[PDB]
Amino acid sequence: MDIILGIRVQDSVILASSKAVTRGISVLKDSDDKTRQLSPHTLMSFAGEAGDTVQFAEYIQANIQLYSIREDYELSPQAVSSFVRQELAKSIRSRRPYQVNVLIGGYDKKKNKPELYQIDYLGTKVELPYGAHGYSGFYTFSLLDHHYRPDMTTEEGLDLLKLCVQELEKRMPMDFKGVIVKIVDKDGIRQVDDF
Amino acid sequence: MDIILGIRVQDSVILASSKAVTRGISVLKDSDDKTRQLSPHTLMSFAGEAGDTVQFAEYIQANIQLYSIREDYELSPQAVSSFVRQELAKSIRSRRPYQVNVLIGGYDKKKNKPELYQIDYLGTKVELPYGAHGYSGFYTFSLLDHHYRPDMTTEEGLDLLKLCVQELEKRMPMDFKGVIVKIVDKDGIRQVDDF
Amino acid sequence: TTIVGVKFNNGVVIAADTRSTQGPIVADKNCAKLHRISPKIWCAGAGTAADTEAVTQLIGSNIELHSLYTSREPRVVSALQMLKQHLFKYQGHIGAYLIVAGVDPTGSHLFSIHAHGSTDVGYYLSLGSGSLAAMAVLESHWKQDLTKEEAIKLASDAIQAGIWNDLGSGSNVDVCVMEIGKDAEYLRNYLTPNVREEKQKSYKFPRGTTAVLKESIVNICDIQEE
Amino acid sequence: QFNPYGDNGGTILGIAGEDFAVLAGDTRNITDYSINSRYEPKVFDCGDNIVMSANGFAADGDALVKRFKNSVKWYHFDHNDKKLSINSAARNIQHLLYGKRFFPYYVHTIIAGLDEDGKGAVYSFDPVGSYEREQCRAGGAAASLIMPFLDNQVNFKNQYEPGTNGKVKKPLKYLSVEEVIKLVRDSFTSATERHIQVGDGLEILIVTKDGVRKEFYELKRD
Amino acid sequence: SDPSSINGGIVVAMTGKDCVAIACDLRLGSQSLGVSNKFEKIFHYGHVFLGITGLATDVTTLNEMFRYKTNLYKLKEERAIEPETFTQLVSSSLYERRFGPYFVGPVVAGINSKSGKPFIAGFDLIGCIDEAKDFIVSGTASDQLFGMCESLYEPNLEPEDLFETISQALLNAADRDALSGWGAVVYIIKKDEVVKRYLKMRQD
Amino acid sequence: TQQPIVTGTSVISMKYDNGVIIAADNLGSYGSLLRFNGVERLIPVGDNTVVGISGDISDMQHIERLLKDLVTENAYDNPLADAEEALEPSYIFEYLATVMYQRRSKMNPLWNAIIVAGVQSNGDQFLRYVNLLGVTYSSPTLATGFGAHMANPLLRKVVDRESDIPKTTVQVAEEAIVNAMRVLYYRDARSSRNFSLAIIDKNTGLTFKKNLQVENMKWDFAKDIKGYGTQK
Amino acid sequence: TSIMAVTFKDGVILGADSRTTTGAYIANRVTDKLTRVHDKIWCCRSGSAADTQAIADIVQYHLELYTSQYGTPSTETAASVFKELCYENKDNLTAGIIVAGYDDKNKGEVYTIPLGGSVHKLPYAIAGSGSTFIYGYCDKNFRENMSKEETVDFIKHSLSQAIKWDGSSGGVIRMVVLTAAGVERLIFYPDEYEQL
Amino acid sequence: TSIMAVTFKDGVILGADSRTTTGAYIANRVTDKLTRVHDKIWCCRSGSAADTQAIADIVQYHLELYTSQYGTPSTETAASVFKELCYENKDNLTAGIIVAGYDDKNKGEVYTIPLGGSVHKLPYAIAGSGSTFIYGYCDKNFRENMSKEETVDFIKHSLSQAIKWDGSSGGVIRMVVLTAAGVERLIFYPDEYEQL
Amino acid sequence: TTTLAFRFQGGIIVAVDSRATAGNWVASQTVKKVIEINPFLLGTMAGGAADCQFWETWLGSQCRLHELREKERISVAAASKILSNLVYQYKGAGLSMGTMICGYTRKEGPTIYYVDSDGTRLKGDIFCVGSGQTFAYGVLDSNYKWDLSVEDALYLGKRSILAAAHRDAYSGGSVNLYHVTEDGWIYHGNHDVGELFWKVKEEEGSFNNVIG
């Protein structure tokens, strides 16, 4: 919607997506997921201009899922990230720009390191242990930098993100109405409840 | 942006106003006041353009209180709301466009009943027992009147205002960061803490 | 830019300032706008620098293809003609301006061709930002039929008044003198009327006046087995 | 449609010494791509060891300078012929700007001169009010060009002693009047080559305690 | 905002004495949001280096596209790409989308194998061969670098003296540009070994 | 906010050792239509100045009246005025500089390009520009409008800088302004064959030469141009 | 840029002003606007320069084939080929072309093509931005079937008026005489015609 | 609309076409554009019709005022009065005005005012936007100090030509002849002017 | 511009930067951005720079005038409201404003009012104004306490300006803090961002995507 967050820890990657979907002057639903698995150790979160976001997500899911079964091997996050970057760049030189910007976290099982790629709608891939987009991207960069340590467990990474959500809540005027918070780890992808 | 609500019971006017002030894309302070009293039994809640709210509310505060002192007896709500409509009516044809909508909820001492008026930014006063302005009135004109009966007590109407707060929080995409409630009766104007 | 072409009795001279400006900043202190279309045809560019350079390549290729095929010398008229169809094709959205001149067996020719694809022939032409500063010189100082020596003087003089009156024309003056039935003389930096001045202090400091944070070697060549 | 602005280029530059100050600027005037003037000084001495240049669009500039000078005459007539301080001149010039705030003057004025303490000073304006005391500010069209060089060699920014690995930054060396003249000249020589609105000549006013000195140096002519 | 200049970055190349230097800022921005403190603008294909300023999307997109083109080269011709030859490849490739162009400002750098010569060249958003051998600068702080480099630059320098001039030329430009000021890497390029040096520079 | 309705184009001028030349075509062009013939741009003011005015003929007329009242103003309250507080080019220029600006500030621009050329009574050559952006500058050589772009470089050969003034004489300067005219006649649409040329000298006084014709005529090279580019 | 084409008993003489204007700057002093498209059919160009230029060469290609394949072309025939290109490119090109040519069986014919495209047989045509000042002069002083000398004088006067009253007219006065005798160039210098 | 005034040896004749057109529709076909503004001075009106209808009366009021206090004006004097009104209110009003008057010491005089307002003395004037087709005609067949009889024919032919070559110029050609015999009006129907 | 101000028990910290930016060009890296209204009131510059410079000095002339006229110190409330009227008169005329008038008086305590050009006068305890106001709140809230030491309060404003300055493009230059007591402000000097940023890295363990 407006809020998308990513913070990458020592052995996992954590993504947050807005629950709410504002359409007009009515927020038509207050629990709705804006994440889809691409693969069993890759989760792509997405946000942006409505109508473009829903379909886009399902197309990247389609092609990547097809690559993995074809090759009988699950594609690394690095490869996955570069694919979404190839669709974006094409779209801005095409008839209808897709205004979908993604955070793609995945646990690279080869390297056995967690890896977070922010990708903006223009199509600029940059690896960052942080990352957000929108105008909710502007409050949380500052807080994350101050308190981050180079490595930590996922539990402390859950509290640190919960600090970010508390800081955003006050100073942003829009109603995202909590967030769906998912952990992307090496033993799968799970959802962990958050206040 | 910004809410003002009104409902009138059988001995009181309950006026409420949003706590938030959002200037820019940042909430400028989370908890604020946003009502000023014209007379010791007449209350003006206001919402509208930036800082035109303040200047106009202070303008009207001086001038109604001026007459009160000279006669030695406060104006009625019929007179006070009317004054304010006159002012708006000049202001929309003047080089200086005020864009301030207000609710005047007072206690008529000479009649012995509350009176709740809706006065528009354009300059139109009509007495109404459930009014509002902005996009407050877009959700709560329906909700009030459903659960409203001609007769009420002060305990009911406060709780019905709490019901209306809840609706607003779900389906309006703006945060208010709570609401303030001052109750205007015959015994003066008092702050009563509510969420 | 500032561009002239002066037809003279025994061939044609085409001259152009060396300055290249992209905006209010000077892109290059020295650049060469007398580009080689064919070995006896040369041209200078004005307008969008990018378009002009691409066009001389694109049309460069076509005229070289036709020359081999017919097994004879390239006519300057063939190059004019090709150029016009091409610039017209896009309706002049393409902002190339060229002054094309050369020598062939049907004689010496000097053409102007505009963006839209209009064409003019004169014995003295200009285009560019300084078309005006050179044009006033060409008209006055010119006389009908000129000597080779005199032709050279006038061409550079016109561009010289160009440098001093037109901000976007500066630096050295290049001259390409094409005599009929005889190889082109590309005479690079004929005239210098703006040098470079010396610096009163010396600039450069001992190493370790710029701090380093990391230092590392990267490969650029093959790897061995050892 | 009329438009009440233009551009007329030129570049000006103030460098504040340690006891003296300089205000320098090319003497070239342009409109689009013709040269209006080889030599019109933009840098005027206005008296009392205060030098003003109002560089930008010339019309606002000629009017502003003439207006500043008339102000200085009226300081002497009302206030009994006393010295106008460089600090007090700066605030005054702000008042002129605000005086037709609502019809903005497109000029970046730099003034320079000595305090009552004899310390250098360069005071530089934003075109419709605001000012700051600076050590170096270049106004005008090739300001972009000239500024980075000054930060490197007058305040020694991003430099360090050799071989200490950026442990100890270069100390601020005493800036001489002779030293400074060399420096302005190479700043304008580079500006001339790489920006199409500078060249012809340069006029450097040297403000010292002993009055205002002129030195002129010619520059390459594009 | 015109879209050639939204996402920041600067590249600066100079020649020295049979060495070339090329150096870049590592700042990626979006209006005023700094995103990452690493994002090399210099990329290299074989022994030729290419810096690219401009809109961030095309920087990445051509990085890869140019990698693609130069890898097909190497394999077909059984020879590495050369800096003189690679210049023309750029120019033609940008002009294929003359209409609707990629918004980039490349700087070629490289030392020719069979000439021994330092070589530099510039381009623009449509693309032109800009051809001075003193130094070529491009990017957001284009105006600023242009001035600075003239002032510093002395033609022909010792490799570690070359290290001094360009890195200083950069550091100053970065700080006084809005969309620069985070990180830098300098490539001092010899014919034997190429040193990458991340600078200790001031943050914004 | 006025727009030019009818306009003069080009006044050229230059400095020489004992005085100045100001010259201009005589035309009131109503856009593409060459409407008015015999319109005279050059107005003598005092007797030591000619002010030439190009731009809107509508604004010109108004400036002419203000200029006439400046002469009349000098006579008033002075026992004499032909060398006591005699009218200098510089005084006139300053009076004009102020009013063009004042009007610019009220957003009704006097739409003109003006050159004031004269000699002072102090022996000093005066030649200066004012226009409708209220921009002023002093320069040894001047030209306005089309003529700035076109004819002014040519004069800049004759005098580049202010130390070649004593090596330029009155016959030579005169020669250069007329070759400058020839060129404006050829290569400018709002330039007529008709022209006036005034020499103010500090020694010879005012010479105002009217109705000169462009000569040194080249058109005999035109029969050798056949076609547009390709045509036999 | 006044161009014209006038019938007379033995032919047609096309007349032109060689000024070529890009705003107040004269782009080139001397450019004939009379561009041959065939041996005995020639054409005149006014309006936008580039557009007429483009079109002209396209006409020469059609008439190169007409000669080659189907024998002699006509003026009528030729003017129709203008009308086709202009009418289909009425939204992209603006060309004011007077086509005239001399037949041995129809004598001189003049067909004007206005900017949208039509064909209009007329004794006389003036077109351009310089013709819009000489309309009055031409009708009153014209009479059909003059003798060549008298014909020259009328054309000469009209184009000389057009330079006096239109600032986008100028350069040498070109005429191309299309007669049975051949094609004759005529040229006239300003010293001669300003007076006349 | 087309208008002129043409000095001769005994006077000046003012002439006008009397179509008024509001868009391509004719408002009134007879309106006399030659207006009296003093006894021996008349003015011709063109351009935006409302604006000149307005200005003319203001000039009328100044010049009756001039007469009572300061003795009778002249043609020079009257032209000045238009020129102020036009100049000052130029940004508001569009007005082209030919000012002809008759004195016993300057004889006929004709002053022209273009739309921005500038005063120019000419031996004949032409103004309008229907006068832009008589230029080549008018320069040749004007001759200074011409006979009275020739004045009738000149203006008749010149405006007649204006009527064929402009669809907004038309109807009765009306003429006001100013001499030291007073003022005589004359009128010429389409049956007379067009054939001749 | 990143200005932010915050009351605590110790006083008011007014923290501002010194980088004014024109566009791609950086206009100044040394500029004062606390306009010193009189010894007791400190204002800040953001929005329109020129507007803020002139009028805030003007508020200052009015402060002295008021002091003379009443023989008592101006109120914080009185100072703001006058500036609020002044800008409301000229609204929509190329006037823009981004000030906090900050004051600590022995009759009303510490008080901050944000004034804007559009006639907003809003009472607060934390404000942030600028283009970097977005960044400022973040660090500032999470490390804020009303019970906070003076030395820590200054430390707090030092970390906030640097966190904003890093991530903002238009902010940097130098860090200027001021602490207003009952007997008025004490200037705490100019600290170059460059140098200061590295020290804060080692001690706090922050800025981990900055390798140095």
Side-chain angles (χ1 to χ4, degrees), chain C residues 3-8 12-16 34 41-45 98-102 110-111 155 159 174-178 185:
Chain C
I3 293 173
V4 303
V6 162
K7 189 57 84 73
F8 60 88
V12 54
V13 47
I14 175 157
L34 300 157
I41 309 178
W42 298 74
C43 58
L98 291 160
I99 296 293
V100 176
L110 169 42
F111 309 119
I159 300 289
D174 295 355
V175 177
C176 196
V177 186
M178 306 176 267
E185 311 187 1

Side-chain angles (χ1 to χ4, degrees), chain B residues 112-158:
Chain B
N112 316 252
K113 46 177 322 297
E115 288 168 335
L116 176 47
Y117 295 97
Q118 183 178 323
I119 316 185
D120 298 289
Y121 78 104
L122 286 163
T124 316
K125 59 160 280 173
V126 273
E127 166 169 51
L128 208 62
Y130 62 89
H133 289 281
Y135 298 99
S136 199
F138 255 74
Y139 278 84
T140 61
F141 284 15
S142 44
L143 189 45
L144 292 148
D145 282 57
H146 180 188
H147 299 284
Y148 182 80
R149 313 165 303 142
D151 284 305
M152 286 295 265
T153 76
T154 304
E155 283 73 61
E156 310 179 42
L158 199 66

